[PDB]
JSON list of C-alpha atoms and ligand atoms in Angstrom, two decimals:
[
{"chain": "A", "resi": 1369, "resn": "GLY", "atom": "CA", "xyz": [68.53, 57.40, 69.13]},
{"chain": "A", "resi": 1370, "resn": "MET", "atom": "CA", "xyz": [71.36, 58.90, 71.38]},
{"chain": "A", "resi": 1371, "resn": "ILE", "atom": "CA", "xyz": [71.37, 58.37, 74.84]},
{"chain": "A", "resi": 1372, "resn": "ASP", "atom": "CA", "xyz": [72.80, 61.00, 77.17]},
{"chain": "A", "resi": 1373, "resn": "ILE", "atom": "CA", "xyz": [73.95, 59.75, 80.65]},
{"chain": "A", "resi": 1374, "resn": "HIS", "atom": "CA", "xyz": [75.16, 63.35, 82.18]},
{"chain": "A", "resi": 1375, "resn": "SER", "atom": "CA", "xyz": [72.85, 66.39, 81.97]},
{"chain": "A", "resi": 1376, "resn": "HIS", "atom": "CA", "xyz": [71.72, 69.08, 84.41]},
{"chain": "A", "resi": 1377, "resn": "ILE", "atom": "CA", "xyz": [67.95, 69.37, 83.43]},
{"chain": "A", "resi": 1378, "resn": "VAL", "atom": "CA", "xyz": [66.25, 69.77, 86.73]},
{"chain": "A", "resi": 1379, "resn": "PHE", "atom": "CA", "xyz": [65.10, 73.47, 87.37]},
{"chain": "A", "resi": 1380, "resn": "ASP", "atom": "CA", "xyz": [66.17, 75.22, 90.62]},
{"chain": "A", "resi": 1381, "resn": "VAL", "atom": "CA", "xyz": [68.56, 72.59, 92.14]},
{"chain": "A", "resi": 1382, "resn": "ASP", "atom": "CA", "xyz": [72.07, 73.40, 90.84]},
{"chain": "A", "resi": 1383, "resn": "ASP", "atom": "CA", "xyz": [73.83, 75.32, 88.17]},
{"chain": "A", "resi": 1384, "resn": "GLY", "atom": "CA", "xyz": [71.15, 74.03, 85.44]},
{"chain": "A", "resi": 1385, "resn": "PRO", "atom": "CA", "xyz": [67.82, 75.34, 84.54]},
{"chain": "A", "resi": 1386, "resn": "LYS", "atom": "CA", "xyz": [66.45, 78.14, 86.76]},
{"chain": "A", "resi": 1387, "resn": "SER", "atom": "CA", "xyz": [62.77, 77.27, 85.63]},
{"chain": "A", "resi": 1388, "resn": "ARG", "atom": "CA", "xyz": [60.30, 74.90, 84.21]},
{"chain": "A", "resi": 1389, "resn": "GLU", "atom": "CA", "xyz": [60.52, 76.63, 80.82]},
{"chain": "A", "resi": 1390, "resn": "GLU", "atom": "CA", "xyz": [64.27, 76.55, 80.73]},
{"chain": "A", "resi": 1391, "resn": "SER", "atom": "CA", "xyz": [63.94, 72.96, 81.29]},
{"chain": "A", "resi": 1392, "resn": "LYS", "atom": "CA", "xyz": [61.59, 72.33, 78.63]},
{"chain": "A", "resi": 1393, "resn": "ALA", "atom": "CA", "xyz": [63.55, 74.18, 76.28]},
{"chain": "A", "resi": 1394, "resn": "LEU", "atom": "CA", "xyz": [66.98, 72.37, 77.08]},
{"chain": "A", "resi": 1395, "resn": "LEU", "atom": "CA", "xyz": [64.91, 69.05, 76.68]},
{"chain": "A", "resi": 1396, "resn": "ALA", "atom": "CA", "xyz": [63.79, 70.30, 73.09]},
{"chain": "A", "resi": 1397, "resn": "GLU", "atom": "CA", "xyz": [67.11, 71.12, 71.95]},
{"chain": "A", "resi": 1398, "resn": "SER", "atom": "CA", "xyz": [68.55, 67.77, 73.20]},
{"chain": "A", "resi": 1399, "resn": "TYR", "atom": "CA", "xyz": [65.76, 65.97, 71.39]},
{"chain": "A", "resi": 1400, "resn": "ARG", "atom": "CA", "xyz": [66.39, 68.08, 68.21]},
{"chain": "A", "resi": 1401, "resn": "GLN", "atom": "CA", "xyz": [69.81, 66.79, 68.12]},
{"chain": "A", "resi": 1402, "resn": "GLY", "atom": "CA", "xyz": [68.61, 63.09, 68.05]},
{"chain": "A", "resi": 1403, "resn": "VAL", "atom": "CA", "xyz": [68.77, 62.41, 71.95]},
{"chain": "A", "resi": 1404, "resn": "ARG", "atom": "CA", "xyz": [65.72, 59.94, 73.13]},
{"chain": "A", "resi": 1405, "resn": "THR", "atom": "CA", "xyz": [66.85, 59.18, 76.49]},
{"chain": "A", "resi": 1406, "resn": "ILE", "atom": "CA", "xyz": [68.31, 61.65, 79.00]},
{"chain": "A", "resi": 1407, "resn": "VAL", "atom": "CA", "xyz": [69.79, 60.76, 82.47]},
{"chain": "A", "resi": 1408, "resn": "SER", "atom": "CA", "xyz": [69.31, 63.41, 84.69]},
{"chain": "A", "resi": 1409, "resn": "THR", "atom": "CA", "xyz": [72.62, 63.95, 86.84]},
{"chain": "A", "resi": 1410, "resn": "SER", "atom": "CA", "xyz": [72.32, 66.91, 88.89]},
{"chain": "A", "resi": 1411, "resn": "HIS", "atom": "CA", "xyz": [74.91, 68.00, 91.26]},
{"chain": "A", "resi": 1412, "resn": "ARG", "atom": "CA", "xyz": [75.51, 66.42, 94.72]},
{"chain": "A", "resi": 1413, "resn": "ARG", "atom": "CA", "xyz": [78.81, 68.19, 95.88]},
{"chain": "A", "resi": 1414, "resn": "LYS", "atom": "CA", "xyz": [79.41, 68.82, 99.49]},
{"chain": "A", "resi": 1415, "resn": "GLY", "atom": "CA", "xyz": [80.19, 72.71, 100.00]},
{"chain": "A", "resi": 1416, "resn": "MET", "atom": "CA", "xyz": [78.75, 73.66, 96.63]},
{"chain": "A", "resi": 1417, "resn": "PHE", "atom": "CA", "xyz": [75.69, 71.61, 95.39]},
{"chain": "A", "resi": 1418, "resn": "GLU", "atom": "CA", "xyz": [73.66, 70.53, 98.47]},
{"chain": "A", "resi": 1419, "resn": "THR", "atom": "CA", "xyz": [70.01, 70.78, 97.33]},
{"chain": "A", "resi": 1420, "resn": "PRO", "atom": "CA", "xyz": [68.06, 68.16, 99.51]},
{"chain": "A", "resi": 1421, "resn": "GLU", "atom": "CA", "xyz": [67.45, 64.78, 97.70]},
{"chain": "A", "resi": 1422, "resn": "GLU", "atom": "CA", "xyz": [63.94, 65.35, 98.17]},
{"chain": "A", "resi": 1423, "resn": "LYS", "atom": "CA", "xyz": [63.64, 68.51, 96.31]},
{"chain": "A", "resi": 1424, "resn": "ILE", "atom": "CA", "xyz": [65.73, 67.17, 93.56]},
{"chain": "A", "resi": 1425, "resn": "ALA", "atom": "CA", "xyz": [63.56, 64.09, 93.25]},
{"chain": "A", "resi": 1426, "resn": "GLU", "atom": "CA", "xyz": [60.26, 66.36, 93.35]},
{"chain": "A", "resi": 1427, "resn": "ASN", "atom": "CA", "xyz": [61.57, 68.60, 90.57]},
{"chain": "A", "resi": 1428, "resn": "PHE", "atom": "CA", "xyz": [62.99, 65.89, 88.57]},
{"chain": "A", "resi": 1429, "resn": "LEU", "atom": "CA", "xyz": [59.44, 64.20, 88.69]},
{"chain": "A", "resi": 1430, "resn": "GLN", "atom": "CA", "xyz": [57.94, 67.32, 87.34]},
{"chain": "A", "resi": 1431, "resn": "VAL", "atom": "CA", "xyz": [60.61, 67.62, 84.69]},
{"chain": "A", "resi": 1432, "resn": "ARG", "atom": "CA", "xyz": [59.88, 64.08, 83.40]},
{"chain": "A", "resi": 1433, "resn": "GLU", "atom": "CA", "xyz": [56.29, 65.23, 83.07]},
{"chain": "A", "resi": 1434, "resn": "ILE", "atom": "CA", "xyz": [57.52, 68.18, 80.96]},
{"chain": "A", "resi": 1435, "resn": "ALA", "atom": "CA", "xyz": [59.20, 65.94, 78.75]},
{"chain": "A", "resi": 1436, "resn": "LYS", "atom": "CA", "xyz": [55.93, 64.51, 77.55]},
{"chain": "A", "resi": 1437, "resn": "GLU", "atom": "CA", "xyz": [55.24, 67.82, 75.97]},
{"chain": "A", "resi": 1438, "resn": "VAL", "atom": "CA", "xyz": [58.40, 67.49, 74.05]},
{"chain": "A", "resi": 1439, "resn": "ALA", "atom": "CA", "xyz": [57.97, 63.88, 72.74]},
{"chain": "A", "resi": 1440, "resn": "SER", "atom": "CA", "xyz": [55.96, 60.80, 73.82]},
{"chain": "A", "resi": 1441, "resn": "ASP", "atom": "CA", "xyz": [59.23, 58.84, 73.15]},
{"chain": "A", "resi": 1442, "resn": "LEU", "atom": "CA", "xyz": [61.45, 61.05, 75.06]},
{"chain": "A", "resi": 1443, "resn": "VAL", "atom": "CA", "xyz": [62.64, 58.93, 78.10]},
{"chain": "A", "resi": 1444, "resn": "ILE", "atom": "CA", "xyz": [63.85, 60.70, 81.26]},
{"chain": "A", "resi": 1445, "resn": "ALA", "atom": "CA", "xyz": [65.58, 58.72, 83.72]},
{"chain": "A", "resi": 1446, "resn": "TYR", "atom": "CA", "xyz": [66.97, 59.44, 87.31]},
{"chain": "A", "resi": 1447, "resn": "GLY", "atom": "CA", "xyz": [70.63, 59.82, 88.31]},
{"chain": "A", "resi": 1448, "resn": "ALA", "atom": "CA", "xyz": [73.08, 62.21, 89.93]},
{"chain": "A", "resi": 1449, "resn": "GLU", "atom": "CA", "xyz": [76.42, 63.55, 89.45]},
{"chain": "A", "resi": 1450, "resn": "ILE", "atom": "CA", "xyz": [78.48, 62.78, 92.52]},
{"chain": "A", "resi": 1451, "resn": "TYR", "atom": "CA", "xyz": [81.46, 64.84, 93.48]},
{"chain": "A", "resi": 1452, "resn": "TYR", "atom": "CA", "xyz": [83.57, 62.60, 95.73]},
{"chain": "A", "resi": 1453, "resn": "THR", "atom": "CA", "xyz": [83.82, 63.57, 99.25]},
{"chain": "A", "resi": 1454, "resn": "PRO", "atom": "CA", "xyz": [84.33, 60.66, 101.96]},
{"chain": "A", "resi": 1455, "resn": "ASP", "atom": "CA", "xyz": [80.62, 61.21, 102.96]},
{"chain": "A", "resi": 1456, "resn": "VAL", "atom": "CA", "xyz": [79.42, 59.87, 99.45]},
{"chain": "A", "resi": 1457, "resn": "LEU", "atom": "CA", "xyz": [80.53, 56.24, 100.44]},
{"chain": "A", "resi": 1458, "resn": "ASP", "atom": "CA", "xyz": [77.94, 55.69, 103.35]},
{"chain": "A", "resi": 1459, "resn": "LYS", "atom": "CA", "xyz": [75.34, 57.68, 101.17]},
{"chain": "A", "resi": 1460, "resn": "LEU", "atom": "CA", "xyz": [75.86, 55.22, 98.16]},
{"chain": "A", "resi": 1461, "resn": "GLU", "atom": "CA", "xyz": [75.93, 51.96, 100.55]},
{"chain": "A", "resi": 1462, "resn": "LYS", "atom": "CA", "xyz": [72.70, 53.26, 102.06]},
{"chain": "A", "resi": 1463, "resn": "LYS", "atom": "CA", "xyz": [71.14, 54.06, 98.68]},
{"chain": "A", "resi": 1464, "resn": "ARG", "atom": "CA", "xyz": [70.39, 57.63, 99.71]},
{"chain": "A", "resi": 1465, "resn": "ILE", "atom": "CA", "xyz": [72.10, 59.26, 96.45]},
{"chain": "A", "resi": 1466, "resn": "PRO", "atom": "CA", "xyz": [70.98, 57.88, 92.93]},
{"chain": "A", "resi": 1467, "resn": "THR", "atom": "CA", "xyz": [72.80, 55.68, 90.80]},
{"chain": "A", "resi": 1468, "resn": "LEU", "atom": "CA", "xyz": [72.19, 55.91, 86.89]},
{"chain": "A", "resi": 1469, "resn": "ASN", "atom": "CA", "xyz": [68.63, 54.54, 86.49]},
{"chain": "A", "resi": 1470, "resn": "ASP", "atom": "CA", "xyz": [68.99, 52.65, 89.48]},
{"chain": "A", "resi": 1471, "resn": "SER", "atom": "CA", "xyz": [71.85, 50.51, 87.75]},
{"chain": "A", "resi": 1472, "resn": "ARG", "atom": "CA", "xyz": [75.17, 49.72, 89.48]},
{"chain": "A", "resi": 1473, "resn": "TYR", "atom": "CA", "xyz": [76.75, 52.60, 87.58]},
{"chain": "A", "resi": 1474, "resn": "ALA", "atom": "CA", "xyz": [77.24, 55.95, 89.42]},
{"chain": "A", "resi": 1475, "resn": "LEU", "atom": "CA", "xyz": [78.69, 58.95, 87.66]},
{"chain": "A", "resi": 1476, "resn": "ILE", "atom": "CA", "xyz": [81.50, 60.35, 89.77]},
{"chain": "A", "resi": 1477, "resn": "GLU", "atom": "CA", "xyz": [83.38, 63.66, 89.34]},
{"chain": "A", "resi": 1478, "resn": "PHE", "atom": "CA", "xyz": [86.60, 65.17, 90.79]},
{"chain": "A", "resi": 1479, "resn": "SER", "atom": "CA", "xyz": [88.34, 68.35, 91.01]},
{"chain": "A", "resi": 1480, "resn": "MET", "atom": "CA", "xyz": [90.60, 69.61, 88.00]},
{"chain": "A", "resi": 1481, "resn": "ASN", "atom": "CA", "xyz": [93.73, 69.43, 90.30]},
{"chain": "A", "resi": 1482, "resn": "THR", "atom": "CA", "xyz": [92.62, 66.37, 92.12]},
{"chain": "A", "resi": 1483, "resn": "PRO", "atom": "CA", "xyz": [95.75, 64.15, 92.55]},
{"chain": "A", "resi": 1484, "resn": "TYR", "atom": "CA", "xyz": [95.74, 60.56, 90.73]},
{"chain": "A", "resi": 1485, "resn": "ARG", "atom": "CA", "xyz": [96.32, 58.69, 94.10]},
{"chain": "A", "resi": 1486, "resn": "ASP", "atom": "CA", "xyz": [93.01, 60.47, 95.52]},
{"chain": "A", "resi": 1487, "resn": "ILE", "atom": "CA", "xyz": [91.12, 59.69, 92.28]},
{"chain": "A", "resi": 1488, "resn": "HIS", "atom": "CA", "xyz": [92.41, 55.99, 92.32]},
{"chain": "A", "resi": 1489, "resn": "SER", "atom": "CA", "xyz": [91.74, 55.51, 96.11]},
{"chain": "A", "resi": 1490, "resn": "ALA", "atom": "CA", "xyz": [88.23, 57.00, 95.70]},
{"chain": "A", "resi": 1491, "resn": "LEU", "atom": "CA", "xyz": [87.27, 54.77, 92.71]},
{"chain": "A", "resi": 1492, "resn": "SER", "atom": "CA", "xyz": [88.55, 51.80, 94.50]},
{"chain": "A", "resi": 1493, "resn": "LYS", "atom": "CA", "xyz": [86.65, 52.33, 97.52]},
{"chain": "A", "resi": 1494, "resn": "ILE", "atom": "CA", "xyz": [83.32, 52.86, 95.31]},
{"chain": "A", "resi": 1495, "resn": "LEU", "atom": "CA", "xyz": [83.96, 49.62, 93.72]},
{"chain": "A", "resi": 1496, "resn": "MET", "atom": "CA", "xyz": [84.41, 47.91, 97.08]},
{"chain": "A", "resi": 1497, "resn": "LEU", "atom": "CA", "xyz": [80.61, 48.89, 97.59]},
{"chain": "A", "resi": 1498, "resn": "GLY", "atom": "CA", "xyz": [79.64, 46.95, 94.41]},
{"chain": "A", "resi": 1499, "resn": "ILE", "atom": "CA", "xyz": [79.19, 50.27, 92.52]},
{"chain": "A", "resi": 1500, "resn": "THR", "atom": "CA", "xyz": [80.78, 50.95, 89.08]},
{"chain": "A", "resi": 1501, "resn": "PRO", "atom": "CA", "xyz": [82.09, 54.37, 88.60]},
{"chain": "A", "resi": 1502, "resn": "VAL", "atom": "CA", "xyz": [81.62, 56.22, 85.18]},
{"chain": "A", "resi": 1503, "resn": "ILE", "atom": "CA", "xyz": [84.20, 59.06, 85.68]},
{"chain": "A", "resi": 1504, "resn": "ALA", "atom": "CA", "xyz": [82.68, 62.36, 84.42]},
{"chain": "A", "resi": 1505, "resn": "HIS", "atom": "CA", "xyz": [84.41, 64.18, 81.72]},
{"chain": "A", "resi": 1506, "resn": "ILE", "atom": "CA", "xyz": [87.90, 62.85, 82.17]},
{"chain": "A", "resi": 1507, "resn": "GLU", "atom": "CA", "xyz": [89.26, 65.78, 79.75]},
{"chain": "A", "resi": 1508, "resn": "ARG", "atom": "CA", "xyz": [89.10, 67.95, 83.10]},
{"chain": "A", "resi": 1509, "resn": "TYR", "atom": "CA", "xyz": [91.47, 66.19, 85.15]},
{"chain": "A", "resi": 1510, "resn": "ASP", "atom": "CA", "xyz": [95.21, 67.33, 85.13]},
{"chain": "A", "resi": 1511, "resn": "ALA", "atom": "CA", "xyz": [96.02, 63.82, 86.56]},
{"chain": "A", "resi": 1512, "resn": "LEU", "atom": "CA", "xyz": [94.99, 62.28, 83.48]},
{"chain": "A", "resi": 1513, "resn": "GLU", "atom": "CA", "xyz": [96.33, 64.57, 80.87]},
{"chain": "A", "resi": 1514, "resn": "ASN", "atom": "CA", "xyz": [98.06, 63.09, 78.03]},
{"chain": "A", "resi": 1515, "resn": "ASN", "atom": "CA", "xyz": [98.45, 59.73, 80.22]},
{"chain": "A", "resi": 1516, "resn": "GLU", "atom": "CA", "xyz": [97.10, 56.77, 78.67]},
{"chain": "A", "resi": 1517, "resn": "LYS", "atom": "CA", "xyz": [98.54, 54.47, 81.39]},
{"chain": "A", "resi": 1518, "resn": "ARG", "atom": "CA", "xyz": [96.59, 56.06, 84.23]},
{"chain": "A", "resi": 1519, "resn": "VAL", "atom": "CA", "xyz": [93.34, 56.15, 82.32]},
{"chain": "A", "resi": 1520, "resn": "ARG", "atom": "CA", "xyz": [93.78, 52.47, 81.31]},
{"chain": "A", "resi": 1521, "resn": "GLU", "atom": "CA", "xyz": [94.69, 51.59, 85.09]},
{"chain": "A", "resi": 1522, "resn": "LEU", "atom": "CA", "xyz": [91.52, 53.31, 86.25]},
{"chain": "A", "resi": 1523, "resn": "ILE", "atom": "CA", "xyz": [89.54, 51.46, 83.39]},
{"chain": "A", "resi": 1524, "resn": "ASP", "atom": "CA", "xyz": [91.10, 47.91, 83.93]},
{"chain": "A", "resi": 1525, "resn": "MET", "atom": "CA", "xyz": [90.48, 48.45, 87.85]},
{"chain": "A", "resi": 1526, "resn": "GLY", "atom": "CA", "xyz": [86.64, 48.43, 86.71]},
{"chain": "A", "resi": 1527, "resn": "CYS", "atom": "CA", "xyz": [85.88, 52.00, 85.91]},
{"chain": "A", "resi": 1528, "resn": "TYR", "atom": "CA", "xyz": [84.55, 53.62, 82.70]},
{"chain": "A", "resi": 1529, "resn": "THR", "atom": "CA", "xyz": [85.10, 56.94, 81.14]},
{"chain": "A", "resi": 1530, "resn": "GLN", "atom": "CA", "xyz": [82.99, 59.84, 79.83]},
{"chain": "A", "resi": 1531, "resn": "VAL", "atom": "CA", "xyz": [83.88, 62.75, 77.88]},
{"chain": "A", "resi": 1532, "resn": "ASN", "atom": "CA", "xyz": [81.66, 65.91, 77.11]},
{"chain": "A", "resi": 1533, "resn": "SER", "atom": "CA", "xyz": [80.38, 66.38, 73.75]},
{"chain": "A", "resi": 1534, "resn": "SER", "atom": "CA", "xyz": [81.74, 70.16, 73.79]},
{"chain": "A", "resi": 1535, "resn": "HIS", "atom": "CA", "xyz": [85.20, 68.99, 73.94]},
{"chain": "A", "resi": 1536, "resn": "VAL", "atom": "CA", "xyz": [84.97, 66.34, 71.13]},
{"chain": "A", "resi": 1537, "resn": "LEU", "atom": "CA", "xyz": [84.53, 69.30, 68.70]},
{"chain": "A", "resi": 1538, "resn": "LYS", "atom": "CA", "xyz": [87.70, 70.93, 66.88]},
{"chain": "A", "resi": 1539, "resn": "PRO", "atom": "CA", "xyz": [88.93, 74.01, 68.05]},
{"chain": "A", "resi": 1540, "resn": "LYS", "atom": "CA", "xyz": [87.20, 76.97, 66.62]},
{"chain": "A", "resi": 1541, "resn": "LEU", "atom": "CA", "xyz": [88.75, 79.57, 64.10]},
{"chain": "A", "resi": 1542, "resn": "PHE", "atom": "CA", "xyz": [87.47, 82.28, 66.10]},
{"chain": "A", "resi": 1543, "resn": "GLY", "atom": "CA", "xyz": [86.51, 82.62, 69.93]},
{"chain": "A", "resi": 1544, "resn": "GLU", "atom": "CA", "xyz": [87.88, 79.46, 71.19]},
{"chain": "A", "resi": 1545, "resn": "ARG", "atom": "CA", "xyz": [87.85, 79.40, 74.92]},
{"chain": "A", "resi": 1546, "resn": "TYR", "atom": "CA", "xyz": [88.47, 75.61, 75.81]},
{"chain": "A", "resi": 1547, "resn": "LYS", "atom": "CA", "xyz": [91.37, 74.69, 73.51]},
{"chain": "A", "resi": 1548, "resn": "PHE", "atom": "CA", "xyz": [92.87, 72.56, 76.05]},
{"chain": "A", "resi": 1549, "resn": "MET", "atom": "CA", "xyz": [89.91, 70.51, 77.08]},
{"chain": "A", "resi": 1550, "resn": "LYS", "atom": "CA", "xyz": [89.29, 70.04, 73.40]},
{"chain": "A", "resi": 1551, "resn": "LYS", "atom": "CA", "xyz": [92.86, 68.71, 73.17]},
{"chain": "A", "resi": 1552, "resn": "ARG", "atom": "CA", "xyz": [92.80, 66.52, 76.01]},
{"chain": "A", "resi": 1553, "resn": "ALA", "atom": "CA", "xyz": [89.44, 65.05, 74.71]},
{"chain": "A", "resi": 1554, "resn": "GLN", "atom": "CA", "xyz": [91.01, 64.59, 71.37]},
{"chain": "A", "resi": 1555, "resn": "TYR", "atom": "CA", "xyz": [93.95, 62.59, 72.81]},
{"chain": "A", "resi": 1556, "resn": "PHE", "atom": "CA", "xyz": [91.58, 60.36, 74.66]},
{"chain": "A", "resi": 1557, "resn": "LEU", "atom": "CA", "xyz": [89.68, 59.34, 71.63]},
{"chain": "A", "resi": 1558, "resn": "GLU", "atom": "CA", "xyz": [92.66, 58.73, 69.45]},
{"chain": "A", "resi": 1559, "resn": "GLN", "atom": "CA", "xyz": [94.04, 56.41, 72.10]},
{"chain": "A", "resi": 1560, "resn": "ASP", "atom": "CA", "xyz": [90.66, 54.74, 72.32]},
{"chain": "A", "resi": 1561, "resn": "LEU", "atom": "CA", "xyz": [90.17, 55.62, 76.19]},
{"chain": "A", "resi": 1562, "resn": "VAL", "atom": "CA", "xyz": [86.62, 56.93, 75.98]},
{"chain": "A", "resi": 1563, "resn": "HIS", "atom": "CA", "xyz": [83.65, 54.77, 76.59]},
{"chain": "A", "resi": 1564, "resn": "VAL", "atom": "CA", "xyz": [80.71, 57.43, 76.43]},
{"chain": "A", "resi": 1565, "resn": "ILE", "atom": "CA", "xyz": [80.05, 60.84, 75.11]},
{"chain": "A", "resi": 1566, "resn": "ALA", "atom": "CA", "xyz": [77.72, 62.76, 76.87]},
{"chain": "A", "resi": 1567, "resn": "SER", "atom": "CA", "xyz": [76.39, 66.37, 76.82]},
{"chain": "A", "resi": 1568, "resn": "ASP", "atom": "CA", "xyz": [76.93, 67.57, 80.56]},
{"chain": "A", "resi": 1569, "resn": "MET", "atom": "CA", "xyz": [74.45, 70.15, 79.45]},
{"chain": "A", "resi": 1570, "resn": "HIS", "atom": "CA", "xyz": [73.19, 72.81, 81.68]},
{"chain": "A", "resi": 1571, "resn": "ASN", "atom": "CA", "xyz": [71.60, 75.47, 79.66]},
{"chain": "A", "resi": 1572, "resn": "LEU", "atom": "CA", "xyz": [71.13, 77.15, 75.97]},
{"chain": "A", "resi": 1573, "resn": "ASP", "atom": "CA", "xyz": [73.88, 79.66, 76.23]},
{"chain": "A", "resi": 1574, "resn": "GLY", "atom": "CA", "xyz": [77.27, 78.71, 77.54]},
{"chain": "A", "resi": 1575, "resn": "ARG", "atom": "CA", "xyz": [76.52, 75.04, 78.09]},
{"chain": "A", "resi": 1576, "resn": "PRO", "atom": "CA", "xyz": [74.24, 73.30, 75.40]},
{"chain": "A", "resi": 1577, "resn": "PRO", "atom": "CA", "xyz": [74.42, 69.93, 74.08]},
{"chain": "A", "resi": 1578, "resn": "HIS", "atom": "CA", "xyz": [76.60, 69.42, 71.38]},
{"chain": "A", "resi": 1579, "resn": "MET", "atom": "CA", "xyz": [75.54, 65.76, 70.79]},
{"chain": "A", "resi": 1580, "resn": "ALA", "atom": "CA", "xyz": [74.96, 65.98, 67.06]},
{"chain": "A", "resi": 1581, "resn": "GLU", "atom": "CA", "xyz": [78.03, 67.70, 66.03]},
{"chain": "A", "resi": 1582, "resn": "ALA", "atom": "CA", "xyz": [79.96, 65.40, 68.30]},
{"chain": "A", "resi": 1583, "resn": "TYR", "atom": "CA", "xyz": [78.30, 62.34, 66.77]},
{"chain": "A", "resi": 1584, "resn": "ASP", "atom": "CA", "xyz": [79.02, 63.26, 63.38]},
{"chain": "A", "resi": 1585, "resn": "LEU", "atom": "CA", "xyz": [82.71, 64.31, 64.11]},
{"chain": "A", "resi": 1586, "resn": "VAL", "atom": "CA", "xyz": [83.47, 60.96, 65.81]},
{"chain": "A", "resi": 1587, "resn": "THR", "atom": "CA", "xyz": [81.57, 59.40, 62.84]},
{"chain": "A", "resi": 1588, "resn": "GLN", "atom": "CA", "xyz": [83.85, 61.13, 60.12]},
{"chain": "A", "resi": 1589, "resn": "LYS", "atom": "CA", "xyz": [87.09, 60.29, 62.38]},
{"chain": "A", "resi": 1590, "resn": "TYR", "atom": "CA", "xyz": [86.28, 57.00, 63.83]},
{"chain": "A", "resi": 1591, "resn": "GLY", "atom": "CA", "xyz": [83.80, 55.50, 61.70]},
{"chain": "A", "resi": 1592, "resn": "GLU", "atom": "CA", "xyz": [80.04, 54.77, 62.32]},
{"chain": "A", "resi": 1593, "resn": "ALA", "atom": "CA", "xyz": [80.68, 51.74, 64.60]},
{"chain": "A", "resi": 1594, "resn": "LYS", "atom": "CA", "xyz": [82.75, 53.98, 67.21]},
{"chain": "A", "resi": 1595, "resn": "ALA", "atom": "CA", "xyz": [80.14, 56.73, 67.07]},
{"chain": "A", "resi": 1596, "resn": "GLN", "atom": "CA", "xyz": [77.35, 54.30, 67.96]},
{"chain": "A", "resi": 1597, "resn": "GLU", "atom": "CA", "xyz": [79.35, 52.63, 70.69]},
{"chain": "A", "resi": 1598, "resn": "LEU", "atom": "CA", "xyz": [79.95, 56.02, 72.37]},
{"chain": "A", "resi": 1599, "resn": "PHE", "atom": "CA", "xyz": [76.69, 57.87, 71.79]},
{"chain": "A", "resi": 1600, "resn": "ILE", "atom": "CA", "xyz": [74.20, 54.77, 71.92]},
{"chain": "A", "resi": 1601, "resn": "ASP", "atom": "CA", "xyz": [75.28, 51.38, 72.83]},
{"chain": "A", "resi": 1602, "resn": "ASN", "atom": "CA", "xyz": [77.45, 51.90, 75.84]},
{"chain": "A", "resi": 1603, "resn": "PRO", "atom": "CA", "xyz": [75.01, 54.54, 77.30]},
{"chain": "A", "resi": 1604, "resn": "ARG", "atom": "CA", "xyz": [72.43, 52.21, 76.69]},
{"chain": "A", "resi": 1605, "resn": "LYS", "atom": "CA", "xyz": [74.10, 49.35, 78.56]},
{"chain": "A", "resi": 1606, "resn": "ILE", "atom": "CA", "xyz": [74.65, 51.64, 81.59]},
{"chain": "A", "resi": 1607, "resn": "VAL", "atom": "CA", "xyz": [71.05, 52.71, 81.39]},
{"chain": "A", "resi": 1608, "resn": "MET", "atom": "CA", "xyz": [70.06, 49.02, 81.34]},
{"chain": "A", "resi": 1609, "resn": "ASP", "atom": "CA", "xyz": [72.35, 47.84, 83.98]},
{"chain": "A", "resi": 1610, "resn": "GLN", "atom": "CA", "xyz": [74.53, 45.60, 81.85]},
{"chain": "A", "resi": 1611, "resn": "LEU", "atom": "CA", "xyz": [78.34, 45.09, 81.57]},
{"chain": "A", "resi": 1612, "resn": "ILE", "atom": "CA", "xyz": [80.32, 47.06, 79.33]},
{"chain": "B", "resi": 1056, "resn": "LIG", "atom": "MN1", "xyz": [77.41, 72.09, 86.53]},
{"chain": "B", "resi": 1057, "resn": "LIG", "atom": "MN1", "xyz": [81.11, 67.77, 86.69]},
{"chain": "B", "resi": 1058, "resn": "LIG", "atom": "MN1", "xyz": [77.80, 67.69, 85.13]}
]
């Protein structure tokens, strides 16, 4: 019963599925890997992903209906992946962009080269709104690379961290295109700086879930209890608006 808090499953709204058929197939693979709750977090990013909320909500509702054709016990929750620009503060305050399952948690992302001071300041301002940032794929940010103190300082401030399932995996013997991200993610896991693993799934070619593989790797490397914490228990608390 894994719980996936980072996903692009809504058709025709961002760089995720293009069609209902693609949404269904992505849901089915996710369920095949053992995922039983998925939080939809389609992009909200000024200058790149600006599909109106109303359309995202409309297609999301249709995706939730489609999930019933996959499994009766597949749970589809609403959410957003919020790229940080200053306008998102008023949007969150006014409840015009979604939090995760209507909890206090919002999924926040930055750019690869965003300076630490900007990351810290943005997250600080979101916290002041009464909202808890879950930081999307921490392995993406140059500012955090090999930097336990910075990560811990964001965490101690009141934030939580998320790592993509794809980057939990070992570098492949052939055709590895993302070794550096895998190396970053591995460092974060080793230093125990990861609250949640999520898929960030978009499709069934370049960006599928790797939740089952990642779950077993964490199980083997850190034990079953840590696998349950990162793939089930922490994501569940987020979904149920409980403190971690
Ligand atoms: Mn995307
Ligand atoms: Mn992202
Ligand atoms: Mn994403």
